[PDB]
Amino acid sequence: AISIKTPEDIEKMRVAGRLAAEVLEMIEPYVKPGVSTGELDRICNDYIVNEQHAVSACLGYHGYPKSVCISINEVVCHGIPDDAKLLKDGDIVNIDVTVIKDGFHGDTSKMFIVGKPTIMGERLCRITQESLYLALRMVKPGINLREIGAAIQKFVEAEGFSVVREYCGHGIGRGFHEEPQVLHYDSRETNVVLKPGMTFTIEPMVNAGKKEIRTMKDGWTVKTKDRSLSAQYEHTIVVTDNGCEILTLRKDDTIPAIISHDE
Numbered sequence: 102a103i104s105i106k107t108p109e110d111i112e113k114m115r116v117a118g119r120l121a122a123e124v125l126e127m128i129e130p131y132v133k134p135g136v137s138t139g140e141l142d143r144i145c146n147d148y149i150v151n152e153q154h155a156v157s158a159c160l161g162y163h164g165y166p167k168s169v170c171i172s173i174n175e176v177v178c179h180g181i182p183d184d185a186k187l188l189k190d191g192d193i194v195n196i197d198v199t200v201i202k203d204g205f206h207g208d209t210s211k212m213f214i215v216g217k218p219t220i221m222g223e224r225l226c227r228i229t230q231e232s233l234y235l236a237l238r239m240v241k242p243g244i245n246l247r248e249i250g251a252a253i254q255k256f257v258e259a260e261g262f263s264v265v266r267e268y269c270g271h272g273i274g275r276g277f278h279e280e281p282q283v284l285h286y287d288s289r290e291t292n293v294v295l296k297p298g299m300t301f302t303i304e305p306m307v308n309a310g311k312k313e314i315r316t317m318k319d320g321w322t323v324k325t326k327d328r329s330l331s332a333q334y335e336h337t338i339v340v341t342d343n344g345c346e347i348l349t350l351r352k353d354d355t356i357p358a359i360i361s362h363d364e
């Protein structure tokens with residue numbers, strides 16, 4: 102019950118993933134001590150709207166009030182950009198971007214570490230990305246989604262950290278969230294066998310504490326229950342004939358765009 106994208110389709114995703122990636126590239130200089138999350142959102146949307154000639158998929162999505170999600174430190178996901186929340190030395194910050202261009206969505210996020218790094222967030226953010234990369238390397242036709250989740254979770258826990266269970270990566274294309282669900286863990290519920298032309302995200306959330314999370318009274322903001330740090334990276338990809346292609350790759354990613362398992 103998963104759409105297989107045509108070559109036209111795939112290329113529209115290329116463009117949409119690139120624009121989403123470039124939002125995250127454009128915003129980096131602004132991710133600085135003193136800056137508010139509200140203005141980062143304004144910058145991102147202005148860019149998406151005026152220069153990208155695109156839309157944010159997030160705005161209005163289940164009533165979501167801003168254009169990107171900005172999650173700071175213990176906030177796991179769906180943190181709401183707010184003119185009064187200021188970035189400070191030490192912070193680890195996720196900005197999650199999704200744009201729609203030409204019928205198609207690109208969906209991506211990364212961690213920024215604000216001003217003077219702290220130490221254990223340096224590590225959480227690193228491990229969380231390494232966990233995304235190891236999943237991206239497994240992706241190829243005929244492998245099962247379940248191996249991928251099981252393999253993320255192993256890595257993450259072996260570090261002292263946990264995988265958040267409530268939120269998962271997702272098929273993506275003309276719909277924001279299409280099949281399949283891409284769990285970052287082993288559940289025997291999961292059985293998807295991958296095939297060229299599927300497009301989906303992988304977006305593990307990792308807590309330096311324990312795996313349990315909590316939603317706030319704004320009905321959006323998810324925090325860790327034990328108030329530890331949590332980190333997330335996300336890429337949108339296409340299954341290729343012999344591996345994958347990352348459609349949201351940034352200049353700062355240290356994994357190649359084209360991952361090929363062929364001889």
Ligand SMILES: CCCC[C@@H](N)[C@H](O)C(=O)N[C@@H](CO)C(=O)N[C@@H](CC(C)C)C(=O)OC
Binds near residue numbers: 159
């Ligand atoms: C408004 C935000 C965000 C979307 C994305 N950039 C993120 O990659 C995502 O798709 N998140 C999903 C993955 O499970 C998600 O968090 N969806 C929520 C939907 C709410 C809008 C109700 C969910 O399914 O919670 C159980």
Ligand SMILES: [Co+2]
Binds near residue numbers: 198199210304
């Ligand atoms: Co996202």
Ligand SMILES: [Co+2]
Binds near residue numbers: 208209270271335
């Ligand atoms: Co997503």
Ligand code: NA
Binds near residue numbers: 194331
């Ligand atoms: Na966080």
